[PDB]
Amino acid sequence: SQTVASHVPFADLCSTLERIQKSKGRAEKIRHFREFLDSWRKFHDALHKNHKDVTDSFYPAMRLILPQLERERMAYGIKETMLAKLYIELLNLPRDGKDALKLLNYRTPAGDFAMIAYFVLKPRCLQKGSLTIQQVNDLLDSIASNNSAKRKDLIKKSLLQLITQSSALEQKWLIRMIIKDLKLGVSQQTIFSVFHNDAAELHNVTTDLEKVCRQLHD
Numbered sequence: 001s002q003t004v005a006s007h008v009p010f011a012d013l014c015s016t017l018e019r020i021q022k023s024k025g026r027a028e029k030i031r032h033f034r035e036f037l038d039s040w041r042k043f044h045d046a047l048h049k050n051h052k053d054v055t056d057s058f059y060p061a062m063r064l065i066l067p068q069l070e071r072e073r074m075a076y077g078i079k080e081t082m083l084a085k086l087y088i089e090l091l092n093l094p095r096d097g098k099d100a101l102k103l104l105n106y107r108t109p110a111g112d113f114a115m116i117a118y119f120v121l122k123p124r125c126l127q128k129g130s131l132t133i134q135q136v137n138d139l140l141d142s143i144a145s146n147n148s149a150k151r152k153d154l155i156k157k158s159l160l161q162l163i164t165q166s167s168a169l170e171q172k173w174l175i176r177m178i179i180k181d182l183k184l185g186v187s188q189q190t191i192f193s194v195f196h197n198d199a200a201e202l203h204n205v206t207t208d209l210e211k212v213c214r215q216l217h218d
Contacts, residue, residue: 001052003134004043005060010136010166011129012039013061014173021110021184029186030194036061037198058195060133066188067180073140077147077155078178080106080113086156087117090163091124110183118172129167136162140177 001007016036020029037058044056063070084103087093093100099120131139139162146154163171176182 001054001134003054003060004040004047004056005133005137006054006135007047008040008043008061008133009129010131010133010170012036013064013133014129014167014170017065017173017182017184018169020186021182023185026186026190029184030190033186033191033194034198037195060137062195063137064133064177065182065191067177067182069188070180073144074148076140076143076178077152078143078159080179082156083113083117083159083175083178086159086163087120090160091120093120110185112176112181112183113179114172114175117175118168121168121171126164126167126171129170130165131162131170136174143178 013036016032020032023029023032040058040061041056044054047054063072081104084100088095088100088103093103102116103120139158142158143155143162146152146158162174166174173182
């Protein structure tokens, strides 16, 4: 294809986020996030060596890592109650049953909704993962668009297209990307710091003495 995100599976990002949040202390979280950046540039290089000059923009992933900074999309219009209904009827859950009961309780304490839905969604599985980062971004684009058109029908439709092709883990992190709080235990400007420091460290500014002369002279 034409972008790196079209080839990176959403399961890679969800994996990185899962071990980031599971990691204690910042060293490990930064280390996993950096593992994801290195995997990203690795995909870029593989695509180049298969004669696919793609862009290496990290924005398709950064918009999912920092959803509260999402600004090209509009509001999804998805509240936690909506997803509660969606998952009750999707898995044919009995109303007033144990799992649905847990789903309707709106405890806002890091035991958020996404962990509840993931707890119910771990026993009953799904065909692992099949979507890439770009396809997830396209479906979220569609949810924000349908919401901008005041079309809850199509919001539930696109959301179901996301859910039926995402593993339980992928849905756990998808919910957090919709609600716009990932609970990673790492700060936004820490992610920005590692993102800039990575590129800066790996850049190796090759000394160019003539260039340097023209620089200090002006």
